[PDB]
Amino acid sequence: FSCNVDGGSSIGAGTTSVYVNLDPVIQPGQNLVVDLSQHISCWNDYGGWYDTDHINLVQGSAFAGSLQSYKGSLYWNNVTYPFPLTTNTNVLDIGDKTPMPLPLKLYITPVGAAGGVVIKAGEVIARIHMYKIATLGSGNPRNFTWNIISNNSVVMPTG
Ligand SMILES: CC(=O)N[C@H]1[C@H](Oc2cccc(C(F)(F)F)c2-c2cccc(NS(C)(=O)=O)c2)O[C@H](CO)[C@H](O)[C@@H]1O
């Protein structure tokens, strides 16, 4: 089982930065939609759904730093979850050698930030833990953490 970010090199476990461009200017009540399907893809290293990989996102996945006061929802594989995750998500099966974009979007609504900076350029905005286990033997379980990082400042000048 392997993943990559923005078509980069293979990732088999561990923590990886994922850089995203965000709507730079927003108003009170407006959300930010972070489509991570456009950035992270994973595949099965045998193909043919031999030793299918089973992946889900993990309880405890959360906003980072100042964003923990913000409201969040996480879309994963046809289901919406409150964010931060207080449970694990449903399981996605991965068996093809051709990468599958992760069916993952983060919806963010800033709270208590009106009149200033909402998100800083270069700041980790969320840490999303992903769990993999396959089918044969031990399943060789692996942990991934996706550190979502904003490429740019976001401001909410009004309110
Ligand atoms: C031991 C193991 O992980 N077996 C898993 C096995 O892993 C591999 C199978 C064939 C080739 C390789 C490779 F190393 F040549 F790539 C692997 C491998 C092995 C460690 C890591 C990774 N990911 S990477 C290259 O570090 O980014 C891939 O894939 C299964 C289906 O996805 C199952 O997922 C199997 O569990």
Side-chain angles (χ1 to χ4, degrees):
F1 179 76
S2 307
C3 301
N4 63 5
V5 175
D6 291 338
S9 55
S10 46
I11 307 161
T15 303
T16 309
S17 298
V18 181
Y19 299 93
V20 302
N21 299 313
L22 299 179
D23 198 4
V25 182
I26 59 173
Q27 61 183 92
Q30 185 178 0
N31 70 353
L32 294 165
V33 185
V34 187
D35 188 352
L36 293 173
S37 78
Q38 301 168 358
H39 296 283
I40 315 169
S41 298
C42 303
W43 62 90
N44 180 290
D45 280 294
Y46 295 133
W49 301 85
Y50 186 75
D51 202 6
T52 289
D53 299 296
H54 309 285
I55 66 173
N56 65 267
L57 304 183
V58 184
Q59 178 189 62
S61 297
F63 287 121
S66 147
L67 287 86
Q68 297 206 330
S69 64
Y70 294 0
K71 295 173 183 170
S73 296
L74 179 153
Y75 170 86
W76 170 261
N77 194 30
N78 302 311
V79 181
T80 301
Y81 303 88
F83 194 76
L85 295 185
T86 71
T87 71
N88 296 343
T89 69
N90 71 69
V91 173
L92 169 69
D93 303 318
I94 285 186
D96 277 316
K97 189 64 144 295
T98 301
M100 182 195 182
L102 296 187
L104 175 55
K105 300 194 199 67
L106 177 55
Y107 297 82
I108 310 177
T109 294
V111 170
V117 172
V118 163
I119 292 176
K120 302 198 249 66
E123 140 170 75
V124 176
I125 67 181
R127 305 173 192 279
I128 299 170
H129 177 195
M130 183 179 95
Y131 176 77
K132 164 258 167 169
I133 189 170
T135 301
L136 296 175
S138 71
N140 300 296
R142 296 298 180 260
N143 292 287
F144 297 74
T145 298
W146 306 111
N147 281 349
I148 314 307
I149 295 172
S150 180
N151 279 332
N152 60 276
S153 302
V154 177
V155 292
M156 185 186 291
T158 71

